[PDB]
Chain A
Amino acid sequence: IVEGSDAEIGMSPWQVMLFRKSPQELLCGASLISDRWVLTAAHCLLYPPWDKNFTENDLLVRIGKHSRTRYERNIEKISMLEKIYIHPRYNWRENLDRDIALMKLKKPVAFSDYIHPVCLPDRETAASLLQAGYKGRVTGWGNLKETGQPSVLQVVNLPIVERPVCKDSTRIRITDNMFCAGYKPDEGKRGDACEGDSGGPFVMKSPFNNRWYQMGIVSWGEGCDRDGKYGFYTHVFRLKKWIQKVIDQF
């Protein structure tokens, strides 16, 4: 997260760190959506142009974390993967369309002051909140600059951007399964996700029922916090049918 700030304790208790077993590194962000299901970006698991292809036993989910590098004894819980499910029409060849994946945990995680699931949107929520100018919140342990790393979880609030501005900011083909967020150069304020924030949640707090919903997944950008560029996010509600089917099946 570039130009964000330290998170408060318990501020994003659905935050998950995907952690590589060997070598022990940050792989990506993710989010807790029930006591046994974790949501992330498919590119966190599968990205053949970079030879990335991870299976269940290559990693661990760390939940309830605040510090990036420390083993937060008596606070975080570290879980094992039972199965990974990537969207079957995830488009890694082109533009990362449908950049979404689910991971089922071997055992349920216990909720705590630091560990709690976020909500997924239904149609009225998405239509209500996914509006140009409405701000969401992105969190992660990723890079602080485009070209080091944070001691603790970072947070940034960013406004959703009109579809035409998003499209005009890039040569890439934007789909209905994406949205972009960030301040325009004219707006003066700053902030973006970046390398390492991949997979983590873009959340909004409904003013109707005062619950936090995950509207987006950190998916891609060109550089980080660059003037006139925006961050691109997976549109969680557009892929909700697939999420339901996988959870209902497995």
Chain B
Amino acid sequence: DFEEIPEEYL
């Protein structure tokens, strides 16, 4: 249920 974060943060 957590929105995905930017791939940069891995």
Q: Which residues of A come within 8 Å of B, CB atoms? A: 19, 21, 24-25, 60, 69-71, 78, 80
Contact = CB atoms under 8 A, between A and B. Distances in A.
B7 to A, nearest CB: 11
Contacts, number: 22
Given A19-B2, A71-B3, A80-B10, 6 more contacts: A25-B2, A60-B5, A60-B9, A69-B2, A78-B6, A80-B9
17 contacts: A19-B2, A24-B4, A24-B5, A25-B2, A60-B5, A60-B9, A60-B10, A69-B1, A69-B2, A70-B3, A71-B4, A71-B5, A71-B6, A78-B5, A78-B9, A80-B9, A80-B10
A71 B2 CA distance: 8
A69 B2 CA distance: 4
A21 B10 contact: yes
Interface of B: 1-6, 9-10
Nearest to B8: A78
A132 to B, nearest CB: 39
A49 B2 CA distance: 27
A69 B5 CA distance: 10
A71 B1 CA distance: 11
A140 B4 CA distance: 21
A21 B5 CA distance: 10
